[PDB]
Design a protein around this ligand. Structure first.
Ligand SMILES: [Ca+2]
Ligand SMILES: [Ca+2]
Ligand SMILES: [Ca+2]
Ligand SMILES: [Ca+2]
Ligand SMILES: [Ca+2]
Ligand SMILES: [Ca+2]
Ligand SMILES: [Ca+2]
Ligand SMILES: [Ca+2]
Ligand SMILES: [Ca+2]
Ligand SMILES: [Ca+2]
Lengths: 638, 638
């Protein structure tokens, strides 16, 4: 800020001046009469500026003091104002000043180093410290997030927290007559916790919003550790402001008087997803009855992609094989710390405990949203939550991509949507600027059922894959044209009725159902084209047929090959069991023919009696954790 | 959006094209073999563009159709694609198109007239309709806001609502196979209500988020009337989006298929305050026991300022004389309608019914916030809510000024604040960008106790007034210097102890208390200087003394003259009853000497045994409604 010091010849004044503050002098308000003019002398530590060697006494003349260094003792710098007139012997008003340093410091340049306007600004030319939600369990002992209680129990825990340092320089007796208090608005106290480091004891938090600091005179440095307890959300834009106030306590009869305030503003780091184009690090599945052979194929694939593997046994599954749906593995990121965090869906089926019990842990965060009992729908399953690779759309850059999730085309009595709380949560993270797609036409309702993304060595570095009946018809028609109309879809499967290409192509109901699906998909195609700035050369159609079953909702006619596992270049694609022609399933060949030229290795995994007949595939039965973007979210300008 | 139409020689295709849409053609995906090249002929209503007179058949060649006018009948425009090769006789794929107009229209230029990107943008170069919260009572009958029920009862009510028109142009039989639906996200349905005008019946609202529209083929225009039901707030940023979807219902077996969507986005108009610099229109007070003479002075003043007058009798007051505190009169503003709206404080003392019963009415809105029973504090009284005149601060313009309200310097066990719900509400209005000041040091705790603003003919067009002990000391000292030390403050008052200037100036405790107040005020001075971009020449000090009573909180030593009524140039200033010197109270003269040169007329109203001894003055016992800014809030860029 600044302060106006009001000087008089009545007697001397005493004031404090915090270094880095603009201090100002009111000279004319008590200049005695007889007087035209004034002069200023000051001790050598005080710099005096005058705009608008002695000056006339005009009320809009401006005088400012700054102080080069902290006072060694009270009143050790002096200012002397001398009023005089044509025939008037000079009179002196005296000002005794005490200078001090009060620097509340934090990582506002975002480099791991703590060294007027306290605002937070995005971009690489911007400013403001980052703060992480301390939502992992470093505490080996119990089952709660670190930040739910009032204590630092491990010292590891401090690595997650943000460092703020108060740095004072004062006369030795200064806190005789002054006290410093640290504080946070009541508005924000339930979202941050602040520990004083001496070991560590809480000083600010949900229970207390202010704390008198115990600070010795001289040069002193006090270290604070800060954790956030809430992600940005609909009712929290994600800034937390911490303030240091300096109080004058000189008069034992009067109340304390504020002399100086400074702040730092923190922005709580958002939860961020990883697209399939990000290198994989760890893979997840369930093990259930008659599953074994699916799991070896997956194991083989992980191994080729360097990935840690992780399975969930039937004692914990409770029959729930759909590892995709209960959770999503994202990250949070600060200059000093980056760590994965599981977004745990309120789906709450058999896998309900898996995210809490097995995933949340040392350097592994947890978050959840929406109602935990009831109020939910299939569209809340995280097979319906994906994210694009980075894209630029008509000049605006989405360096972390854009979250995608499925929705209906309009709300009705029969329509489903992802719960508002999740949608609200995802938008509040800002940096991935969610897009709504149309998936309610699918029986299960998930965007993973009609799309996937894969890395590609050229263009923008990926391909959007989309399921395409058009493409499967063209392929099958082609095969009929070269004589293979007799070929049998479902060849090699027992307790299932083979069907010939000729009878498939002639089936008019099937051709109708697929035309309706073609429309549902094409709608999303243009939608993705617009909202991700894609062109056709970014997109590849995967031959895929559907059918309409109950409520005229759409299921996969044969294994949904786009519902694949993407481990870098190693694809784990469902086994279509197509019509076999010249030794090979023509589906597999068509796919390979589209993906192998991009460096991709296609492994066809058999999921037929395990997952496909249960209305899901490989992607639906697995999950991946992947490398965080290198791009720092705070450099975006959402 | 756009649509991709996929053409084949297999058979002809049929499609709809909404005018103003980019329609695109996939030619290569089924071009028969034998074929190098293609040509396009089309009926005269279809415009064909090709980038990248006959063209080679390359998949990245681009073909787009636009249509000049609505179809008179189904398929009345044709496109014919001819594939051919070196030795291959031409083959034709046929596309039959139906063009239609679907224009959902609203006042997006903000001029009272309804005639791709559906976003709302601020500023005078921006775009997006405005929508008002229908929070008045045009319904003469009952006591609820118009918008709480599901019906339009008066036709006057429609003047408050916003007009949206659907404008279609189709073949006569078009809605044989297509249906239009109007909708709003479930997220927003509890905040808007939409009536179809035929008279008017609700079609969208809290209970229903979609509605099948009954629309004849041909040229038709359907009128909708929209009201909002919620102001922008912490959980509502203030946009409401209404969408028209076009569905294909051709196939009786398949589900409906979306063909086209368009939207309009409305922004719900914020509640806006009026500073004292805005011309007055209506004045409010109470009448109580032994009040009569206060009320005549006020009546006289209103009359000179052209103002409607309005009083509240003791049957309704219930002893509550503080008309300032229970309410604040602001406005809401759309291009088609502007109307005042009372913000009604949760204070809920004797005047509790006055805003509901007597102020809310025909072209008079109502709003309220915060808890209605308990949870409140004195700082929630609207003597603690003010607004500045328009100001520019370091280049950023605040054309409606900035709300000011009082707060503590930091939260403690003894501190008070205005309730979070009000603070949140005020910030959510955006356009007045509230500033927090320090008022908790006052016993009562209100910013009207230390500041006021008044119009001024020069400079920025106002003066900030601030209470100033400094100034009262200087004045009194001056009077002692010219011999009048003997003069008596409280001269002319019975049952009150006169005190001489000499004994006042010598009273060291009083001089101490006032020094502490001087600091509390000076803190706000710099605070206002910064946040309103003020300079000293914008500010005038009003001589005023205080004392500290209970919890060392500050009360007025003599009637708080800055707690005045401002009716344009006609000021209604409390009667200080100062020491009388040369026929006149020197306080009154000092004030007059500061204000009369700005054109201001100072009337000193006696409120001493009526209000001053009850810890409030003229401003505290009254209220004003004033002319809305002419500047349209939506032209701001907050
Ligand atoms: Ca802890
Ligand atoms: Ca931790
Ligand atoms: Ca769960
Ligand atoms: Ca950790
Ligand atoms: Ca997912
Ligand atoms: Ca109504
Ligand atoms: Ca109305
Ligand atoms: Ca009330
Ligand atoms: Ca009205
Ligand atoms: Ca007010």
């Amino acid at each position: 800020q600044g302060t106006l010091i009001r000087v008089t010849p009545e007697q001397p004044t005493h004031a404090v001046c915090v270094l880095g503050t603009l201090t100002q002098l009111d000279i004319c308000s008590s200049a005695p009469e007889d007087c035209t003019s004034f002069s200023i002398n000051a001790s050598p530590g005080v710099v005096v500026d005058i705009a608008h060697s002695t000056w006339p006494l005009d009320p809009g003349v401006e005088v400012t003091l700054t102080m080069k260094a902290a006072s060694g003792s009270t009143g050790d710098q002096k200012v002397q104002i001398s009023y005089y007139g044509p025939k008037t012997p000079p009179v002196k008003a005296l000002l005794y000043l005490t200078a001090v340093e009060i620097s509340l410091c934090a990582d506002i340049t975002r480099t791991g180093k703590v060294k007027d306007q306290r605002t937070w600004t995005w971009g690489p030319c911007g400013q403001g410290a980052i703060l992480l939600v301390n939502c992992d369990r470093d505490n080996l002992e119990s089952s709660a997030m670190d930040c739910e209680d009032d204590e630092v129990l491990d010292s590891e825990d401090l690595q997650d927290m943000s460092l703020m340092t108060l740095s004072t320089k004062t006369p030795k007796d200064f806190f005789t007559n002054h006290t410093l208090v640290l504080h946070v608005a009541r508005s924000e106290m339930d979202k941050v916790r602040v520990f004083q480091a001496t070991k560590c004891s809480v000083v600010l938090g949900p229970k207390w919003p202010s704390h008198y600091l115990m600070v010795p005179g001289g040069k002193h440095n006090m270290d604070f550790y800060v954790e956030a307890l809430a992600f940005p959300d609909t009712d929290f834009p994600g800034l937390i402001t911490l303030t240091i106030s300096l109080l004058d306590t000189s008069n034992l009869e009067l109340p304390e008087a504020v002399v100086f305030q400074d702040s730092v503003v923190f922005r709580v780091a958002p939860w961020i997803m990883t697209p399939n184009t990000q290198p994989p690090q760890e893979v997840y599945a369930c093990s259930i009855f008659e599953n074994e052979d699916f799991l070896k194929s997956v194991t083989t694939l992980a191994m080729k992609a360097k990935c840690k593997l992780t399975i969930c046994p039937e004692e914990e599954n409770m029959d729930d094989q759909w590892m995709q749906d209960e959770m999503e593995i994202g990250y949070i990121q600060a200059p000093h710390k980056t760590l994965p965090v599981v977004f745990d869906s309120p789906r709450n089926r058999g896998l309900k405990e898996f995210p809490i019990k097995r995933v949340m842990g040392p350097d592994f965060g947890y978050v959840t949203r929406g109602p935990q009992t009831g109020g939910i729908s299939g569209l809340d399953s995280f097979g319906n939550l994906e994210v694009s690779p980075p894209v630029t759309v008509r000049g605006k850059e989405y360096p972390l991509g854009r979250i995608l999730f499925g929705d209906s085309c309009y709300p009705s009595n029969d329509s489903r949507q992802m719960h508002q709380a999740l949608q609200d949560f995802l938008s509040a993270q800002q940096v991935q600027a969610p897009v709504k797609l149309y998936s309610d036409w699918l029986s299960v309702g998930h965007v993973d059922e009609f799309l996937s993304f894969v890395p590609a060595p050229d263009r923008k570095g990926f391909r959007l894959l989309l399921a395409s009946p058009r493409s499967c018809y063209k392929l099958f028609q082609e095969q009929q044209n070269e004589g293979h109309g007799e070929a049998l879809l479902f060849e090699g499967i027992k307790k299932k009725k083979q069907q010939k290409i000729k009878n498939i192509l002639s089936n008019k109901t099937l051709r109708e159902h697929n035309s309706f699906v073609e429309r549902c998909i094409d709608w999303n195609r243009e939608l993705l084209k617009r909202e991700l700035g894609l062109a056709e050369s970014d997109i590849i159609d995967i031959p895929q047929l559907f059918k309409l079953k109950e409520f005229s909702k759409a299921e996969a006619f044969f294994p949904n090959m786009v519902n694949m596992l993407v481990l870098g270049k190693h694809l784990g694609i469902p086994k279509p069991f197509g019509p076999v022609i010249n030794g090979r399933c023509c589906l597999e060949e068509k796919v390979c023919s589209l993906l192998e030229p991009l460096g991709l290795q296609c492994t066809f995994i058999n999921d037929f009696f395990t997952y496909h007949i249960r209305h899901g595939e490989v992607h639906c039965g697995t999950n991946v954790r992947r490398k965080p973007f290198s791009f720092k979210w705070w450099n975006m300008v959402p």
